[PDB]
Structures are given as C-alpha cells and as structure tokens.
Design a protein around this ligand. Structure first.
Ligand SMILES: Nc1ncnc2c1ncn2[C@@H]1O[C@H](COP(=O)(O)OP(=O)(O)O)[C@@H](O)[C@H]1O
Ligand SMILES: Nc1ncnc2c1ncn2[C@@H]1O[C@H](COP(=O)(O)OP(=O)(O)O)[C@@H](O)[C@H]1O
Ligand SMILES: Nc1ncnc2c1ncn2[C@@H]1O[C@H](COP(=O)(O)OP(=O)(O)O)[C@@H](O)[C@H]1O
Ligand SMILES: [Mg+2]
Ligand SMILES: [Mg+2]
Ligand SMILES: [Mg+2]
Lengths: 118, 370, 370, 370
C-alpha cells in the first residue's frame, strides 16, 4: 500500500464527472442553450451556472458586463446567494473555489443542486 | 446497498466505501476561520474553510481542530466536517447508506451518544455502528490473537485480544500522540533559533516532523554521536524560502513516546504500557501475545519505532518468550481497512443500530449495542 | 444613475464617469491667484485661476496646492477644485450622481470626515464613498493577491493583500514622492548654474523631471560612466527660449527613491519597505506576494524602475523564491480605472453612504462604512 | 570580593553591585551613530554614542538597539554597551569581579554561549553566571511559590514555580512587550495627525506612552465614554514646543497586552497565557499558584493593570479560588534586586562558572551549569 489512493480518488472523480456533465448538458438542452464539454474549465467565469440556475428555478438573473477575474467572482457570489436563498446548505463552497477550478469542490455544489431538486 | 466507513480520527479524517481496499478521500480535519480584514466587494468569500481547502488558504486562517485527545470538543463544526465528507468529498446521499464510525476505548459516554444522535437526527442514516479503533486493526491485519498499539494525534491504546475475547481489564490508554510530539518539536526548535508560534506555523512544524524525524535505536548513543557534528543534520525549506537545519531534534522529538517525562508526565513510555498490558493478562496468554504486537495508527511510522520497541520489550519479557512486532507497511490506514472489511461481513447485518431501534430506545442504545 | 469616480490625488485630479475605461478630465490640482499689479479697467480678470488654465497663465500667479502629502491643508480652495471638476470639466449637477473619492492609508481621520461633510453639505450628492487607493489598483490589475506599491507626488504606501483580505498590520507608508523628487531636482540643478526658484520655475522643473529623468540600474557604476562625458547629456528648452544641459542629475533625482538619505530622510528606500511589508505577512503568504508586486501611481513611470526594483528585491529575497514586478503600461491611471470598475459592480450598491445615513449619524459614519 | 549583577535587559540596562538594594546606574541600551555631515575641524567627535548620552543627542543619530526580543542581534555593539557599563558607569576592573547575567526562557543556545565567550575571552572576568529572569523575580519578592509574569521591551514570559521546583513544561513565552506597544502607539497617533517616523521620534513616542497611557478596566465601556469628549484628553509638550492631545489612545495602546489581535498576532493576551500556564501545572499546585501572581518587569507598571489582570483571571478560574496579584511598587527593578540577593548568598557562591572550568570545557558549559 504505497499510497495507491490517488488513482482511486481520480477514477471516482471521473465517474462522477461523466454523470454530472451529462445531467447538466441534458438540462441545458431543454431551454435551448449550447452544450458544454469540459466540467472543470467551462465553469470558471460563473456565467453558465447562472442561466443553468435560472432554468432550474424559472426566474431572471442578470450578469455583470465585464470579463476580468473580479467579474467572475461577482457572478459566483451571485450564484451562491441564489443557492442560499433556496436553503441549499453548502459549507466549503466559496467564490474562489469555482474560479480556480477546484475539482474536489467544483463538483461538490453541483451535487448539492442535484440533490436539492432532482 | 453499500455502507460507509469513515474513520473519523483525531488528526486526518479518512472516509471511504465499505468493501473497498482504500479510503476514497482523506484529509486533515481542521476548520479555519479567516481573521484579517476583508476588503474586496465582488468576492464570493465563504466564512469557514475546512479540510485541505483550509490547509491551503492558510495564512488568512485560524486553524482549529474540533477533536482533541480523541474526544469531540466542538459539535458545531464537527458537524461541518461530516457534512463536508458526505457531500463534497464522496458526494453521496446519507439517507441511503449505513455509516460505520470509529472511536477510542475509555472515552466519555456522551461522546458516542451525541455522535449517534447527530448521525440520526441530522443526516438521517438508516443504520449506524460505532466500533473501537483497535479492533478494526486486528481485522485488517487478519489475526485473531494480538495486542494492538495504535496511536497518533490524540491517543495510544493497547487492546489485548486472545480469540475474539478482548480483555477489558488490560487495556491501557495514554494521551501521548502526534499532536504532543508536534508541540514538543515546535518547542525544542526554539533553541536553534527558529520560532514557530501560530497555527499556520504549527502545520509547518508537523510537516517537518513527518519527514525528518526518526527514532533512535539507542538514544544515549545517538545523542553523544550528534555532539560531534556528522550526517545527522538535514534541511527543510519553508514556504517563506528560508531553510532550517535541525540535527539533534530529530530523534529527540519522537523519543517522547518512550520517555514521557520529556514533556512533563509520569506515565511510562509506550514500550512499557505494552508490557504492563500483557502482564495484566493471563499466563496462558502472554506466551503468545508477545508474538503478535500489531502496531497501527499514524504516529507509529517513524523510521525507528518498529525496532526500538522490540529492543525495549525483549529487555522486559523473560528471556524465553519469542517477541515479534507486526509492523505492516500500511500500518496507518489499517483501522479503515478493517472497517471496510467488517462492514462487508455477511454475519454483521444484525449489528447495525437501525433507525427503528433509535426511535424506540433513544440515543442511549449505543452502550447496549456496542 | 451613473456615479462619479474622481480620484483627487496630491497632484493631478483625474475624474470621470463610473463604468467607462478612461478618465474624462485630467488636470493639476493647483489654485493660482495673481500677484502683480493689474492696470486695465475693462478686463474681466477673474479672482483665482484653477487647473490647467492656472497652469498656462502661470507667469503672474502664485501657484499653490491644497493637498500636501495626501492630507488636505486648505479647504477653501479644495472646494474650488471640486467645483471646477463638477461644473467646467464634466458639467454635471452632482445632485444626481453619486461620488467615489479616494484617500491614502494612515491619514488623519478629520481629513475624510471633513471631506464627506463637504460632499454632503455643499454639493448635496445623493451618496458618496471614499476607498483606499492601493485596493483600487489591485481591482484594476484584475488580481486578488498582490502588494500594491502606489506612489505619486504625495505618498508611497504598500498594502499587502492575499485574497480580498488586506493585512492592515503590514501596510507601510513612506512619505516621499514626486513633489520631494522635484524639490530635490531643483535643488540639485543649481550646482551647474540654472536657478529655479518661483512656483512657475517649479512647474518647469517638474516638466523637466517628467521627460529627462530615468532610474539607473547600478547607480554607482552610472556615476563613473557619466563622469567621462558621454551620451548622458540632454538639452531641454525652457519656455524662455534658452536651453540647458543636465547630464548627471537625470538619474540622481529618482535614486532618491531608493536612498532617501539624499534629502535627509532616515527611512529606507522603496525596495526595503516592500521587502519589510512582505516579511510582516505570514509565511504562507510571502511566496505569492513575492510574485505579484503591482506598481501604481505616477512616480513609478520612470523608465528603468521596473528593473531596479526587481534587482533590489531579488537581492534580499530568498534564493529560491520567484520575484515578478507587475508594471502595467498605463499604471498612472490604474487607481482611477479600478475605481471605475469598483463603482460599476452590482454588489457594490449596498456600500454607498446614503444621504439619509449621513443625516442620521453625521460625518462619523465614514469610519464605520469604509 | 564583590560581584556584578547587570540585568542586561532588552531596553534599559540595569547594572549594579551584588549585595546592594538598588542598581548603581541604569540607562537605555541604544548605540547611536551620527548621520549628518560634520563640518568643524577641531572637534572631539566620538565615533558612536551609547547610552543616555546618545539619548541626549538624538537629532544627529540613528538609534539602534542591539537586543531585539531578548536575543542579541548585533554582537559588535553589545560589546560596546558592556564596555561602557563597566568603565564609564561603574568604573570597576572586570578582571576582579564575578559577573551575573540574566536572560529570558526559550532563548537560542547560541545567545548564552557567545555571551559567555565574550565575557571571558574579552573581559577576562574571574567567573560568570547567567540566570533566568523570572526566577530572580521570585527571589526578590521573597517567595518560593509563584507564577512570575515578566514583561518589558522584548519578551513576556511566565515561569511557574511551586517550591523551588520550576515546571519547565509550563512556561509560556510571548513576544508582545513594550517595544511593540510603542510601535503600535506611534502607528495609532496618525489618526489625530501627529506622525512620528524617525528613531529620535520613536523615543518621543515611548516617552509619551510611559507617562500618559493607563490600562482600562472595561475597555468597551471606556471606549464608549471617550466618544463623548470628557476628562480623558491629556496634553503633552514635545521638545519642539508644540502640544498634542491624545484622548482615546491612552488605553488603546496597552490594551494590546490583552488583545494582540490589534497588531495581527494570534496569541491570547497576558490575562490568558497566565491561566493556560496555571492549567498546565498540577491540580495540587493550581490552588496556590492562583494566589501568588508575581508581576515584574517594566511594562507591568501601567496604572490599571493589577486590576484588569485580576478581573480577567477571576473571570476564568473556578468560582471558589482566591486570586491575588502581587505587584510591588518597585516591580521594575525586581529582577535586578533578586540578582543582588542571589549573588550574595553564602550557598550560591560555589555555582559560578570559574575561568578554569571554561578553559577546560569550552563555551558549551553554560548549558551544563545553568
Ligand atoms: N510518517 C510519519 N512519521 C511520523 N509521524 C506521522 C507520520 N505520518 C503521520 N504522522 C502523525 O500521525 C498523525 C496522523 O495519524 P492518524 O492515525 O492518521 O491520526 P488519526 O488517528 O486521527 O487518524 C499526524 O498528526 C502526524 O503527527
Ligand atoms: N511621465 C512621467 N515620468 C516620470 N514621472 C512622472 C511622469 N508623470 C508624472 N510623474 C510624476 O508623478 C506625479 C503625479 O503622479 P499622480 O499619479 O498624478 O499622483 P496622484 O496620485 O496625486 O494623482 C508628478 O508629481 C510627477 O512627478
Ligand atoms: N511607567 C511606565 N509605564 C508603562 N510602561 C513602562 C513604564 N516604564 C517603563 N515602561 C516600559 O518598560 C520598558 C523597559 O522595561 P524593563 O523591564 O526595564 O525592560 P528590560 O527588561 O528590557 O530592561 C520600556 O520599553 C517601556 O516601554
Ligand atoms: Mg488512527
Ligand atoms: Mg496615484
Ligand atoms: Mg524585565
């Protein structure tokens, strides 16, 4: 046991990622939104979470007319405020975790939303 | 319907899936709060980091352990660590799997009671079972006749077992583990000049310990050797960029385990609580409990102890009994390995504390089911 | 309802509109009044010229700055400068737009208190907000982890920032900047013959400094190089028509920044304040503060400053640590750009100091809202 | 043959003669050197000024302390301080008297090693002995059961002692002494307007602190009182003739000793390192360690400290335990008084480190004899 757990965790992450991205793609394709291919890079700027979340809820969500990093973090703050307003209780989920693309966390809040609605 | 096995230790939490052979995800169990003033309006800053996240975003944080000396001294955030493990690290629904928890012997009853209450009334597990940490070790080692000695960051047991018959009058507990070794190392680092004070620096001291400290075979000899400078020194390199060179405080940190007076304690070292735990057993048992000393737990991974312990015991036990120290290479995850085994035994499904039993009995059912 | 972002530094007043990417109006913050005798019965000679107007007609004026070293000395005319900005340059009744002012760290409380009292009780702005400069510089640079070296004409202050969490126990504020460099330059010219004494002559010396002075790389070597007369000399043409030729003192004026002993100060040059402000922060933060040293402000627009700074910092940082100096091309306006970004965010709107709140609490509300 | 007891602190140097009741000559331990240009041919301008002489001629000097946080940084000028205090202050021949030196707990070994090396190989004293400070404090207080709290200009440490038996596993060193208080004060004056940058001005701020700052009893209540301007203000007359009026920051400066979050430190104030040190001892000792809390060292000479300390402790200790702080009126020289007592004991005079022992063993002998 020369610390083989690395590969086990990575394969677990892969099998979670495939199902998660299939679910989010099937949800994007209902409202006429373009599908995505990368779970961990096409969620940096925090925009695709916003329209996805409004399609999950059914309301409007504005976006900041910017492109720098602080704009991404403001979008993700919006996402987390919206999520909290629906009593979705996340713990180690912050604005910087998404924008840094943290695998262990970037598919933690997706599972939270999934478990909340689905 | 698989079950969960989370060896919620006192240092790093190690959780995973029953039946498997390795924890899916391990991580230090520290919850951190940011302490400096936050001035950036558009940030999505959380208010409580936990796990490797808190370990990384460390300079802004007051790291704190919820579990101390095996017992849980903060239920507010131990709940946070469990939430983290269930939803972010494994991403599973608690309402679907039964959970297996571990614990140390001679722990307050309120600990396991509240543990069960929280695992039912908050995560709604269908079934939960809390086992003693030094028996899953025997399961994992495959034996049935040994004297486990697990330790690290909070405790040090000795649960002598003859044949599925633990001898509960001969279990010695001793609170002399990784955290106390860490603090002692941090305190002797001062005399060279280096001064680590905050928690963000206690982490660096722990990491110095893990990869520099070894256990002397003969302490009074190694000390006199390290006096005339030799190959003893090493060089760790902080995240600051500066390097340090500890040469002597490498076997003087883990020598605490064998001389607990180094930190101001009466209790005898781990090389002697083992012998006392044996001598409390029966004569017809010692003659082979000597021959199965299953070491477990984290802090038993120094490049030393697997031999200095044997050397120190064969100077106590009679000159005839044959002594042997079973130190498997993964003597760290052995508790969780045993957990993944025990949760997957056919003859075990009549042990869990089903939710019906909790509702018809209250939380005080753990004492009678375990 | 777009807001206003008027960063009124010690020297130039850069104002504009929240949201855009450039300040509309830029002009020095001087208030000139005539001194010579006026003999013309019909002229509409105004009372006090202010702005680049008062710069062009500086032959018969006594130019004078209201802001000295960040703090505000004369309020009767700073009111005039704000009035000018609002009514002649931008031409916008402030009663509609909010306003975002900028200050410096470690400034007398009464400064920002009177500033907001004036803004509400003389312009009736609907809401105002005063934000520290070296945070807006990070905003503009799009970072969240830097150590902002801001310096122009009034101050030179670092503010280390890790992730939106500034460390107010480590901001160093050296009070040496463009105006002191200009005074030293005009004091060091006179060893060749050229004498600049009046305030107009001081503006001329500044117009020299801005376009003939660079920063040496190895100052001691550049001395002996320019000793044997070489390509160093330049020729600048005063508004009179005559020419001058400064050869040596074009790199000794900004070497003051790195050795403030040239002007009798005791402090350490802008490199050691940066290194000390880094060493005050935590070990985990030093690694990635060493890599993002966002320069800002005017005075850091000297030609060879991004390299002298880097060499000087690498000379005292650890050997294995990576140093990078983030010197954007238009760093002069970086503070205002960050201000425009900050006021144009959506989350920010709950941070303004509504006029109602000022009527409730009074001027002390700034210390608790900012 | 009498002996020398020089409590070479980290601020003032209190030296004298073994046996007496008061030090001969005390003086700040600052070595100053001129920085301005000297133009007068016929002067006896000394190279470097040291002591109260330098403290008199500041406006020419760069005052630097050799000792920072207990440890000695510059070994060149500390030699000058000892030379001064042996010849110009006491006017004694060092080759005749044995010398007693003091130190703080948890200091680099190299500190006392080189201290001995300099004391023998340079001054050729007949014998030398370095004793921990907070033990001499008990000596002078005439007790044998206390928990000293030594603190001034440097380190702050407790040394619990039960019956001549120190408990080395329960001392709690902390680097939050008067120098950090002074720097925080001269950082917090800037709110009112007065800036003090140079070292010659840092002395002025220390002097303001020493005779204007008290310790609140209830900090929040005192703060809420100072908001409605009242009898808190006090005026101080600089050596320039101007006056300043610090109202609020008369307790906000020494409140650091209890909330070291005001400087970015993580540790808990002196009211709680004391309680932690007591709880680290044994149960049978806590009952009469709570009774004798000897305070020593300068920084414990604020007005309201023997009361806020007592309240803050009795708010922690069990409800049925009698707390008493022993704060003598000479709690500033108590360390040296204990030194004079000790060096004049008929029993002790065979514990020195005679020159023979140093020459036969080497500088590593202080760890053996102390
Ligand atoms: N290789 C090693 N050498 C020395 N000490 C170690 C090593 N690995 C881990 N430790 C110590 O063991 C502790 C973790 O042990 P572990 O048994 O995982 O704790 P827990 O019982 O809480 O799970 C750490 O705090 C560390 O101090
Ligand atoms: N092109 C330049 N080269 C060198 N120095 C300059 C240049 N432009 C401006 N400066 C210096 O910068 C100062 C103005 O800086 P600025 O950023 O306007 O300060 P503030 O923050 O007060 O607005 C002037 O005093 C001048 O000395
Ligand atoms: N009356 C006073 N009130 C508060 N602080 C004082 C007073 N007198 C001295 N101090 C502080 O005590 C320090 C010197 O105390 P001392 O115990 O002599 O230090 P050391 O142990 O280094 O000699 C000074 O730095 C000063 O800050
Ligand atoms: Mg373990
Ligand atoms: Mg600027
Ligand atoms: Mg003292």
């Amino acid at each position: 046991f020369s610390d083989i757990i690395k590969s086990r965790s990575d394969e677990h992450n892969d099998v979670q990622k495939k199902t998660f991205t299939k679910w989010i793609n099937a949800r994007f394709s209902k409202s006429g939104k373009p599908p995505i291919n990368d779970m961990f890079t096409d969620l940096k700027d925090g925009r695709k979470l916003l329209d996805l979340l409004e399609g999950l809820t059914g309301t409007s969500l504005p976006k900041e007319r910017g492109s720098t990093r602080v704009h991404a973090l403001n979008n993700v703050n919006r996402v987390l405020q919206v999520l909290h307003q629906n009593n979705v209780e996340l713990v180690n989920i912050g604005g910087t975790d998404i924008v840094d693309g943290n695998h262990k966390l970037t598919l933690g809040l997706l599972w939270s939303i999934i478990l909340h609605w689905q | 319907t698989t079950a969960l096995v989370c060896d919620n230790g006192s240092g790093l939490v190690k959780a995973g899936f029953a039946g498997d052979d390795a924890p899916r995800a391990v991580f230090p169990s520290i919850v951190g709060r940011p302490r400096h003033q936050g001035v950036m309006v558009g940030m999505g800053q959380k208010d409580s980091y936990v796990g490797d996240e808190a370990q990384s975003k460390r300079g802004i944080l007051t790291l704190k352990y919820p579990i101390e000396h095996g017992i849980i001294t903060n239920w507010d955030d131990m709940e946070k660590i469990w939430h983290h493990t269930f939803y972010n690290e494994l991403r599973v629904a608690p309402e679907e799997h039964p959970t297996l928890l571990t614990e140390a012997p001679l722990n307050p009853k309120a600990n396991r009671e509240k543990m069960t209450q929280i695992m039912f009334e908050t995560f709604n597990v269908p079934a939960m079972y809390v086992a003693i940490q030094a028996v899953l070790s025997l399961y994992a080692s495959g034996r049935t006749t040994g004297i486990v000695l697990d330790s690290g960051d909070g405790v040090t047991h000795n649960v002598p077992i003859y044949e599925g018959y633990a001898l509960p009058h001969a279990i010695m507990r001793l609170d002399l583990a990784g955290r106390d070794l860490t603090d002692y190392l941090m305190k002797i680092l001062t005399e060279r000049g280096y001064s680590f004070v905050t928690t963000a620096e206690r982490e660096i001291v722990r990491d110095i310990k893990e990869k520099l400290c070894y256990v002397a075979l003969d302490f009074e000899n190694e000390m006199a050797t390290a006096a005339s400078s030799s190959s003893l020194e090493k060089s760790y390199e902080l995240p600051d960029g500066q390097v340090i060179t500890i040469g002597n405080e490498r076997f003087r940190c883990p020598e605490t385990l064998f001389q607990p007076s180094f930190i101001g304690m009466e209790s005898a070292g781990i090389h002697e609580t083992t012998y006392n735990s044996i001598m409390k057993c029966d004569i017809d048992i010692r003659k082979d409990l000597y021959a199965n000393n299953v070491m477990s737990g984290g802090t038993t991974m120094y490049p030393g102890i697997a031999d200095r312990m044997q050397k120190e015991i064969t100077a106590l036990a009679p000159s005839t009994m044959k002594i042997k120290i079973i130190a498997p290479p993964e003597r760290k995850y052995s508790v969780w390995i045993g957990g993944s085994i025990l949760a997957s035994l056919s003859t075990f499904q009549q042990m869990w504390i089903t939710k019906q039993e909790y509702d018809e009995a209250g939380p005080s059912i753990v004492h009678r089911k375990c």
